[PDB]
Amino acid sequence: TRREAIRVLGLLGALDPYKHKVNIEMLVNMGNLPLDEFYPAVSMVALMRIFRDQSLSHH
Amino acid sequence: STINLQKAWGAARRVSKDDWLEWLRRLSLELLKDSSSPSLRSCWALAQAYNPMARDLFNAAFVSCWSELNEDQQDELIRSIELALTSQDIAEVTQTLLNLAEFMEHSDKGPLPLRDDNGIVLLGERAAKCRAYAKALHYKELEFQKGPTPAILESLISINNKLQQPEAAAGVLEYAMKHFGELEIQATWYEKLHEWEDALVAYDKKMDTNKDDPELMLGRMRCLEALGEWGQLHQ
Amino acid sequence: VGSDPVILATAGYDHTVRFWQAHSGICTRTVQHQDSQVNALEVTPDRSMIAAAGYQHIRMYDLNSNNPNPIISYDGVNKNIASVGFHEDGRWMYTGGEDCTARIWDLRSRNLQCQRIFQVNAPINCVCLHPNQAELIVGDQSGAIHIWDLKTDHNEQLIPEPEVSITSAHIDPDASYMAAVNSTGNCYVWNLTGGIGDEVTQLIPKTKIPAHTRYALQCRFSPDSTLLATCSADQTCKIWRTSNFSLMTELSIKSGNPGESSRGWMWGCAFSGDSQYIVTASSDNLARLWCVETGEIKREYGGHQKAVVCLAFNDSV
Amino acid sequence: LNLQGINESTIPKVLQYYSAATEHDRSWYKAWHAWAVMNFEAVLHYKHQNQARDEKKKVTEDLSKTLLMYTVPAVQGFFRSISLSRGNNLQDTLRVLTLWFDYGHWPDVNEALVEGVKAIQIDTWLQVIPQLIARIDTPRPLVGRLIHQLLTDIGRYHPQALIYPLTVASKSTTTARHNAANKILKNMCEHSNTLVQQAMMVSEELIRVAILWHEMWHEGLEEASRLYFGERNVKGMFEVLEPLHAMMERGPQTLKETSFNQAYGRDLMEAQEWCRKYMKSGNVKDLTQAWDLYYHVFRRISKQLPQLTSLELQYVSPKLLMCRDLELAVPGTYDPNQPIIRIQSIAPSLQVITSKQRPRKLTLMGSNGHEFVFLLKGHEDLRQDERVMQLFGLVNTLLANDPTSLRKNLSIQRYAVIPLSTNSGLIGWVPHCDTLHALIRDYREKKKILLNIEHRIMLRMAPDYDHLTLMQKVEVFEHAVNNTAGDDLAKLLWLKSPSSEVWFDRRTNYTRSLAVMSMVGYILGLGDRHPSNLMLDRLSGKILHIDFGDCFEVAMTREKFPEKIPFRLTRMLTNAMEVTGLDGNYRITCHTVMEVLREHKDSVMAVLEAFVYDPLLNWRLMDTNTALNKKAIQIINRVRDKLTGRDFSHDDTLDVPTQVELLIKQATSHENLCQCYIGWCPFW
């Protein structure tokens, strides 16, 4: 599969990304508040990654 | 959280990638209990369940642990950082070790005193091996504002062809004309920037004074095959 | 004070104009100024008073009486009057403005206006005058030296090179050499012609010398027609001569510290009677007495506290 | 043109030379483009020959009967270019009008407009709607009456993009201008009888929201007092007061209008009686009581000026509270190839920007659940600032054909200026952007540094900084450069970005997007630009500018040290660019702009012939003279001499890198930065 997919992607030719783009938060709140107010305001920032659709079903 | 700090720092017994990724997880677990703020304790129960939890709050648990000890074990922390990337460089481990030196310099307490050099050469070469070209330009203004030496500006031309920014490397040749001279101008800049017309005078005045250098002989013979003059090259 | 043939006056920024002596080292008095600055200082040759010019005012002081008061203040002209010109005894007066006018004033007239207006196309930088009211030499910003006549208006416009910015002009009493130094450092040397009753003055290009690199401030010939100094802003001064153009003494007031710059420039120079002593005004608040041939520190006066641009000098013995 | 040029012998040669190329391919655009340009330049060359050899009606007839012979190559050459333009209608539309603006009283022009107007598609002339209204006072019955026929053809399709320049036409000063506009407004009421009567109700009440009653009496007293006390005004003072005396006949209706009645409405009608005690002889005691009342109400108005922070719309203009479900779409973004987006209603409360010139920051409600923020100004000049907005898109159009310009990927944002009156307007506020005045001045308190710490030391050095000469402003400049650091503004970008890949891209976008209007403004003639007009994207880092209304000697009229500085050369803009030198993102960035702004002659010579020849916009040349024929020729002479690059030495034609080099050391050295005003602040 690997030796033939290179042949498939290379027999077409090259492609420029500037014409390809025609068809197709973490460190911001710390810059305003000091370190004494950011240390309680980070744990829920470490908790909302669990709130992305995957890591809830066992814990 | 005081006596047990002198155990997981000077290990130096890491061979396989399981051990290299197991060291950072218990290091992130050790950085939690030292902070006096109770907001860092709630994630310790979730770190045993969720395995990438070490990649979530390691920035906030570093300054609160570094600014707690009585200025005695900070040098041991510096030696634990420096001896972690000495040999057997794994890419994401070096990414984690360069992300540890990121949260500190956004504050008003100064950057991290790694090597008493603020992390220029040691983490920059690891970021260059990990292909972090946005990180490779950060210490360039550190090297420029601390004394221009002739081993600085010759390294920025190699990180521009894979960055595809030709205007950033085109402001380099005329900078050495009215500030540096002629003795500090080499033929390295003309080769990687893909021109072979104006440099032929430089190759003729360089290769005729000294002996026939092999690398300059390989560079001189591209002047006939990149422009389309295959008549003299066969001779 | 008035019996001193060597008259030296130094002005500052703190509304103080102080008269300094030669070989005594005693400050006489201070002159208070009213809410402006003084741009030009010149001792009148009658050995009784001294004239000055500043922003939106033209005033004259006294030398004999201590702490004088302004009696007659010729006003009406504004916008940075810098260049002054005077008679060989102290009768006439000429001010130079940027409004492309060549005003003719008098100390014994009645009207408070000018006499005639000569129009140019650039602001006037330097004004040179013959001692018996013969010709007028005008330097501009565009780089066109103008020679003008008082009663017939014989214009002589000379453009050496575009993109220049001249500093000062001077002529020897023998009327035989002229030097023009721009902001770059090109010293145009022009030979004169001895025409008194005919006004020939056909100029001949002798030798262009790019001596200085940075900006210049003032050039002045020697009264013995021997030397020629050109002050620059690079904290050094390379004086030259007229005949052979040989480097005699490089007066260097440089520091040598790369971490400490902008101490003091070579603002004003003044040749002595036998071309041995020179008066140096700088911005380091240390008025030094340098030498021409030797070039060492003779006297030091840390009296002023602010920067000094111009001076007033007279050797009327 | 390389061998001989233009004379009285090569004009019949090039006609045959282009008609030979015309007869082969009829569908080839350049045979009707370049030949049309060659026909259009002949009329201007003949006019310049007449104005330079004869003038500086016996010659006017010999010119007009000659141009009658050169008419049949000239007029019919453009319409085939407008039937085959397909996108570039910025040049093919106006060139059949500017001759019609000059000699439109001809029967040949009358028979020439039949085949062009009545045989063109509708999607071409939907962009020249505000420009074809400002010629309403033409005394010729043939020129000034074709607009009433043109609005019939334009107004048949897309009626939503028509009333925004028609609102300002019915509020003219004199009588004879707005009568034809009222005729146009009566003609526009034959479609639905829904949009005009509601659009007037929206527009007049948003003008009522824009300016208040007690705000105008401030400058109404400050003008009418100071003219009479300083400049010896007799009859013009009543001319200043008479718009204020022709206002209080409508009567109060609402709660704020009742508060104005109980707060001030007792002495405004009575003081005119004092004026009736002044018109008989001109006494002092029969008028100083009116001055007492004016000076009493002036302080009472001025005490309430810091008390205006947030307002509610039911107090000022509650006419937008009764009846709903309108059809008022979003102004400025009406595209014929996109569906319409309507506005539901107005927000009851909105944050209002407090400044010196009194702006407003209003918002609208879209039909997709997203907010739209706009800026609302008053008593200013933006009729000249809207004539430079249509040239912001044609640059992005022209950079889409040459392959050098495609590799840079210019993203030049723009908006649409909505006209309101002769003094107020509507600025399209680009959301999530900022000026740099809010970044540095909030960053300056972070490192425990006060504001004037670089200034007071200069007050220790020289307190006469606005009074020094040319040679004495040399040493004072570098004290804030060599002593103090310069890496302060480069750290506040680092304290905002979440990563470093986006950070270097945004920091380099701050630099690569400032050298694209530094030479366009050099052609246009900018000067005296304070940094509060800067527009920086707080998400991507793009550079935009506003307030282009002092060009062409208006910025060089003032006597408070008029500078000759086209682009900024402070320590901020120098140290913002990184440490490879000074020609990294400045020389190569200017390498691309020069050819794409030089050889596109048809697009750069199609905009400046509109607002200069506009009779409503010549008053900026009136402000120079404390006539127009001497100045209007020299303006286009200066434009041509800046486009050819022969500004310094007039012996040879310099190429692109030499012209880029000419715009470097003219502002790098210090002879031009010390002739500036204190508001420019070279110590920043």
From Swiss-Prot, chain C:
GO terms under cellular component: cytoplasm; cytosol; lysosomal membrane; nucleoplasm; serine/threonine protein kinase complex; TORC1 complex; TORC2 complex
Q: Could you say what the effect of mutating S48A is?
A: Does not affect ubiquitination by the SCF(FBXW7) complex
Spell out the protein name for this chain: Target of rapamycin complex subunit LST8
**Which Pfam families does the record cross-reference, listed alphabetically?**
WD40
Show the SUPFAM superfamilies listed in the entry. Quinoprotein alcohol dehydrogenase-like
Q: Where is this cross-link: Glycyl lysine isopeptide (Lys-Gly) (interchain with G-Cter in SUMO1)?
A: K306
Source organism per UniProt: Homo sapiens (Human)
Q: Where is this cross-link: Glycyl lysine isopeptide (Lys-Gly) (interchain with G-Cter in ubiquitin)?
A: K298, K306
Q: Where in the cell is it found?
A: Lysosome membrane; Cytoplasm
Point out the cross-link Glycyl lysine isopeptide (Lys-Gly) (interchain with G-Cter in SUMO3) in this chain.
K79, K208, K238, K254, K298
Gene that encodes it: MLST8
Record PTM Phosphothreonine, positions in chain: T44
Give the quaternary structure: Part of the mechanistic target of rapamycin complex 1 (mTORC1) which contains MTOR, MLST8 and RPTOR. mTORC1 associates with AKT1S1/PRAS40, which inhibits its activity. mTORC1 binds to and is inhibited by FKBP12-rapamycin. Within mTORC1, interacts directly with MTOR and RPTOR. Component of the mechanistic target of rapamycin complex 2 (mTORC2), consisting in two heterotretramers composed of MTOR, MLST8, RICTOR and MAPKAP1/SIN1. Contrary to mTORC1, mTORC2 does not bind to and is not sensitive to FKBP12-rapamycin. mTORC1 and mTORC2 associate with DEPTOR, which regulates their activity.
UniProtKB/Swiss-Prot annotation, chain D:
The name this protein carries in UniProt is Serine/threonine-protein kinase mTOR
Query: Where does the record place the FATC domain?
Result: 652-684
Q: Which residues carry this modification: Phosphoserine?
A: S349
Annotated positions binding ATP: S355, Q357, L375, K377, E380, Y415, G428, W429, V430, T435, M535, I546
Query: What is the reported tissue distribution?
Result: Expressed in numerous tissues, with highest levels in testis.
User: Where is the stretch described as Interaction with MLST8?
Assistant: 448-486
UniProt family annotation: Belongs to the PI3/PI4-kinase family.
What ranges does the record give for the region G-loop, renumbered to this chain? 352-358
Find the cross-link Glycyl lysine isopeptide (Lys-Gly) (interchain with G-Cter in ubiquitin): K256
Span of the entire protein shown here: 1759 to 2549 of 2549
Mutation: T167K; reported impact is: In FCORD2; somatic mutation
Subunit details: Part of the mechanistic target of rapamycin complex 1 (mTORC1) which contains MTOR, MLST8 and RPTOR. The mTORC1 complex is a 1 Md obligate dimer of two stoichiometric heterotetramers with overall dimensions of 290 A x 210 A x 135 A. It has a rhomboid shape and a central cavity, the dimeric interfaces are formed by interlocking interactions between the two MTOR and the two RPTOR subunits.
Q: Which residues carry this modification: Phosphothreonine?
A: T354, T363
- Ranges for domain PI3K/PI4K catalytic: 346-626
Residue span of region Sufficient for interaction with the FKBP1A/rapamycin complex: 202-334
In residue numbers, the region (Activation loop) covers 545-570
Effect in UniProt of substituting S349A: Reduced activity of the mTORC1 complex
Localization per record: Lysosome membrane; Endoplasmic reticulum membrane; Golgi apparatus membrane; Cell membrane
UniProt note: domains? The kinase domain (PI3K/PI4K) is intrinsically active but has a highly restricted catalytic center.
Q: What does the annotation give as the result of altering S405F?
A: In FCORD2; somatic mutation; increased TOR signaling
Swiss-Prot/TrEMBL TPR repeat ranges: 88-120, 121-160, 161-195
